Subunit: 314 residues, 4 copies
């Protein structure tokens, strides 16, 4: 919140790179308006002796129903870059998604420890992409976050792409899935039948996402498709969502709509630009407290109870 004010002050067009959406930015604003019209129906008088925000996802415990979204070139925002964010994420018990275009090599990020995920962009040489998957799995990464909604970038630098493009198809997905034992997570699913097909294709999860409004301008917000997608998947895979998550109440709204967890992107970068690793740990601490507070006020002792909350659209 006030964090973005600090990120704006400290350069200036790097900000617009971080904050911007594609085209008219109609999908960027719509992510927020979609969240703002969701209302939670809280439950009262339930035992809260042991409110816990922990979830199990991909066989591993997380402190919050949240992971750091893949954002490229994190040294654009702070000299420590991805190493700072990955350290704070590890300390907070939340997974950190290593970006294919990270300004620090993925093996260095994975060495920080914690719960590193690796976001894969499909390269036009198939075996370069599959090599990236092997490096991630060798480095102890716990999941392959296959970004599918970027056949090309939706309509500067510096400093480096320390890990070193084509449209990804369902064949690319099967190639990754055959090449790894890690859960494959498809990021950028918006159509209900794409979610069903993702389960059929063997994905361990999907991220319901319009890329923070950065790919197709006019794409439906992920939060607007979340409940339909959760019903269609019927527990067949983890369903994450991102786009405009700015508070613990937003996390609660997402989980009440059925999400397993959320990704948080831009705010984590604001906390990185302002106060580096300590600033990220600060944001994660604030988010952890807000999630815990929102869940208790809503009568939910666990994230699973929060998923059973009803909502109303306003």
């Amino acid at each position: 919140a006030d964090l973005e004010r600090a990120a704006r002050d400290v350069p200036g067009e790097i900000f617009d790179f971080l904050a911007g959406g594609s085209g008219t930015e109609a999908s960027l604003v719509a992510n927020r308006t979609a969240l703002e019209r969701v209302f939670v129906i809280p439950r009262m008088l339930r035992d809260l002796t042991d409110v816990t925000t922990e979830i199990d996802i991909f066989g591993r415990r997380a402190a919050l129903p949240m992971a750091v979204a893949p954002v490229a070139y994190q040294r654009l925002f702070h000299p420590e870059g991805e190493l700072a964010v990955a350290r704070a994420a590890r300390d907070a018990g939340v997974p950190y998604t290593i970006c294919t275009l990270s300004s620090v090599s993925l093996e260095e990020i994975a060495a920080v420890g914690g719960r590193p995920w690796f976001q894969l962009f499909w390269l036009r040489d198939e075996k370069r992409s599959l090599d990236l998957v092997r490096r991630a799995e060798d480095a102890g990464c716990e999941a392959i976050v296959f970004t599918v909604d970027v056949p090309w970038m939706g309509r500067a630098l510096p400093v480096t792409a320390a890990n070193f493009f084509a449209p990804a198809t369902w064949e690319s997905v099967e190639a990754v899935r055959a090449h790894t034992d890690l859960p494959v997570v498809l990021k950028g699913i918006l159509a209900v039948e794409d979610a069903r097909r993702a389960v059929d294709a063997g994905a361990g999860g999907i991220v319901v996402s319009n890329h923070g409004g950065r790919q197709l301008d006019g794409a439906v917000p992920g939060i607007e498709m979340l409940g339909e997608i959760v019903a269609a998947v019927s527990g067949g895979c983890e369903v994450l969502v991102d786009g405009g998550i700015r508070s613990g109440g937003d996390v609660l709204k997402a989980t009440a709509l059925g999400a397993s967890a959320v990704l948080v992107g831009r705010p984590v970068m604001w906390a990185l630009a302002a106060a580096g690793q300590d600033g990220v740990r600060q944001l994660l601490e604030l988010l952890a407290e807000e999630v815990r507070d929102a869940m208790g006020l809503a009568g939910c002792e666990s994230v699973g109870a929060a998923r059973r909350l009803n909502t109303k659209l306003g």
Copy 2:
């Protein structure tokens, strides 16, 4: 209306304590927007020889379908504090809810006479809470208003808590109910099944309320849940509502949606900060006239007829 202008002038951060909501204050604004989109379908040409705003509630007559909402530390707004409000409420024939955190002891408020209700916050020692219930019942209070939507405060001083916390559960509710012959009223019910369970638990009433938008930010407004809750309860208990009631037309809207009565909080404090007891009696007089006018223009000779009015959402 103009009263809040007088309350703002007379200190300054005490105002923000009285007016504010939690988080983004989305539920605070939504209480008002929910009321503003309700439209009443008035009835014409009915006999109005004896329009009466009186209701029976908890075996006792009230002059209006309204009671003063529990607001803590009323000496923050005027030296007479709760004694002034309780006196004006008594003179107006409307019940007054004594707050657990009242800046004047509950026995003194009850001595003013009238129709005192007592709002209970659950204390972590059960028998301290049950003692508070006994003191209220011994003091002639007519109802226990069990505030349920505060397991803890949703995200200064002075002057005193003259009557001297843990999450309240359904077990706490049964303990109160077993300890008193007074009707137990659960304040902060928003879920339809919580309303049904409240009747099953033996409550004499519920207040459909998101705490004036002060607990869970993003909680659905009570007025948005009122009609569903009234149908589900099917006369099993009294159903009150609060949040943003600012006029007699708002009272009419609430009763047309099925409420037995409304609570009024912040406006009564504005009338207390500006002109003390006389100012509260002024507000209650104005509200009484507006309710009577709204009911007549709507073709309702009684509050019960007003409950049978249809509405349309705009």
Copy 3:
């Protein structure tokens, strides 16, 4: 449109008397917002050899699906007062509603000729009211417009009430109906069952109206209830509507929703305050042209065809 700018310039609080609504004026604004969200589905390629805006209503032809709404004390706006408006209305072929509180006697207005209607306010002496009905019928008035939505005025002067109050009930309606052979028209009907009962009570018409937002604040706009009321009445009586009619497209919208005709109030007064009788005739000429244009663009050769147009809400 620009006419109201001229009315504002020429005194000043008389303006607010003419333009204002009751309470928060939520029903005044809602009359306009309701009209603005109605969209007409025009028909194409129909023969328009003889587009006519004429209707038959109460056995008499009118040049437009429109009559001048009853507005009291028309000398507040111009020295000629009601005589000016009645003359222009006569020349335009539209009925003129004589108000019970007219600043010129009803017999003088009726002498102007044309199609005078008489709006009745119920007086607390029944036989005074029935005398007013007899005077109107003796004076050649063609309809009794019984204003029902004023049991009392919803929450100055000079100059006179040249024709010289209690709540009107269904008994008052039957007394009028038994006392006259003129069609009785109930003005201020908003509830579907009040419309049905109006037909059962022998009314020749109803005006679906929230009194221009001047009676119950928060009353549903008449245009929002019009289509439901038209279906329920099933041709049993004429169904008029008023409130916010500001153009020929608005007249078309009203007729497409099923109205037999509209009443126009405030704009006719603006035309009276600015340029007197010639100004009213100007407004009626402009409205007549806009209605004719709107009907042709919508593919309607007659008002009856316009009533069969479909609409969509936006």
Copy 4:
């Protein structure tokens, strides 16, 4: 976008002639608001080896699902006028609609080559209108775009009407259809049954259009009727739409709602006023790129796939 800024700078009331709508311009704004509330549900992971924006329409290939809308007197915006626009349209592979009120004769426009369509206004002498149809067909025009929504203009100059009015009926449509072998396209269809009748009358296409909000003020936007009309026609004719198409995402939205193609009017004139033929070719190049980008991000290799995209209203 920025093009309109250049068109505004370069005279001034000619701008208002180009940009304006009829009446309150409620239908002009509604064309845009209707498009802005449509959201596309993109598909992921489909093969995009050969994304093509080409369509077949009236037996001829077009480079884009788009044609230049008929706009009169194009020398009002640039000395080259229609010849400039027709040349750029030809070079871009998009059809160009010759206007009946063109400031350059239709035979000269058709000589530019490409895919000229001819927009017919019905003249009150039938055989003058049918002569215009014969001239267009003799000149190599590929379709008669019969403008039906102008029985008269909905509520200056210079320079000329180089080709040299009555309401057009279904009889006029049959006269044209009997007089030409070219496909007849009815422009200005908004009612579902008018679309069905258009197919029954032998039309080869319709343009779902409220004339850019320039005819009936308060007419429903064409985009709001598009999906219903497409279902009712059931492939019986081509269904085009116009009004507020300002980007490739808008083209995608229109095709996802079922349109065969869009017409683009005002933006093409802005590109003509600013930089003449080169400016139009620039706009068509930008639109071609945006359409291609939007289609790929939406997972559509062809316009036909784009027509099978689902949408959600926001």
